[PDB]
Amino acid sequence: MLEKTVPRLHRPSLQHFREQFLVPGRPVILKGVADHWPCMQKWSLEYIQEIAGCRTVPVEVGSRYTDEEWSQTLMTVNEFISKYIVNRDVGYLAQHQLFDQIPELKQDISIPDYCSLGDGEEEEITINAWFGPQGTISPLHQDPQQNFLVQVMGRKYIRLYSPQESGALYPHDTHLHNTSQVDVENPDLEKFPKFAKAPFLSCILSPGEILFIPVKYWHYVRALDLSFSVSFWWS
Numbered sequence: 001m002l003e004k005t006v007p008r009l010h011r012p013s014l015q016h017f018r019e020q021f022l023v024p025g026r027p028v029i030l031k032g033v034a035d036h037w038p039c040m041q042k043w044s045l046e047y048i049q050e051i052a053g054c055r056t057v058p059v060e061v062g063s064r065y066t067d068e069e070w071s072q073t074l075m076t077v078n079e080f081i082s083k084y085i086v087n088r089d090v091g092y093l094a095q096h097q098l099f100d101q102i103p104e105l106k107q108d109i110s111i112p113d114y115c116s117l118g119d120g121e122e123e124e125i126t127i128n129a130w131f132g133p134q135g136t137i138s139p140l141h142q143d144p145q146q147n148f149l150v151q152v153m154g155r156k157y158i159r160l161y162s163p164q165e166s167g168a169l170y171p172h173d174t175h176l177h178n179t180s181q182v183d184v185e186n187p188d189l190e191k192f193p194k195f196a197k198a199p200f201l202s203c204i205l206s207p208g209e210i211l212f213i214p215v216k217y218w219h220y221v222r223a224l225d226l227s228f229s230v231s232f233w234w235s
């Protein structure tokens with residue numbers, strides 16, 4: 001009823017991606033694109049520690065719903081892995097440009113062909129690593145650019161709402177990057193009534209798959225396993 005699955009397409013043409021997805025601002029999962037990038041066979045937990053273990057990175061801890069509700073700390077990848085993954089409490093190496101810090105890792109990925117349909121130059125695209133244990137929640141929010149979210153390790157549950165459905169999501173609208181006040185998986189419907197009947201797409205995103213999140217399409221993301229994603233912001 002309220003819930004449909006995000007469509008999946010194998011290697012759709014540039015033209016079809018443009019006409020049926022990019023312009024109308026509709027999400028889709030692309031298959032058979034990021035699928036043989038070397039990172040898919042290579043990036044084990046072990047490999048990441050060997051290559052990146054000693055590098056310092058920002059690690060996020062807390063409810064990213066309000067602003068005071070969270071915090072970042074700078075630590076080595078090795079400290080992150082032992083304190084937040086191997087064995088207790090919740091932390092997330094989120095939204096970090098790891099590939100500018102460690103240029104060798106750039107060899108293991110590619111810029112999706114589909115980005116050339118934008119206006120922007122290729123140098124202008126922002127590439128982020130999202131890396132953390134099962135349970136990482138990134139609350140419902142919009143990004144000001146288009147996104148290809150590429151899953152490498154593990155799976156993620158993602159929920160998506162149209163921008164035309166903003167009213168029913170009760171935005172803070174205290175930031176542009178607007179964020180929602182509703183907990184998609186434990187919402188007080190007394191406090192947020194209109195949300196109940198709001199239509200959405202969802203999916204479970206698996207290794208090799210790419211999620212296209214249109215500019216300003218609302219998204220919520222939860223990691224079902226030990227996870228590593230790579231996002232591409234572009235326009």
Ligand SMILES: O=C(O)CNC(=O)C(=O)O
Binds near residue numbers: 136138221
């Ligand atoms: O992957 C996550 O935890 C959240 N990611 C995003 O909101 C994104 O890539 O735009």
Ligand SMILES: [Zn+2]
Binds near residue numbers: 067175
């Ligand atoms: Zn703020």
Ligand SMILES: [Zn+2]
Binds near residue numbers: 143219
């Ligand atoms: Zn986002």
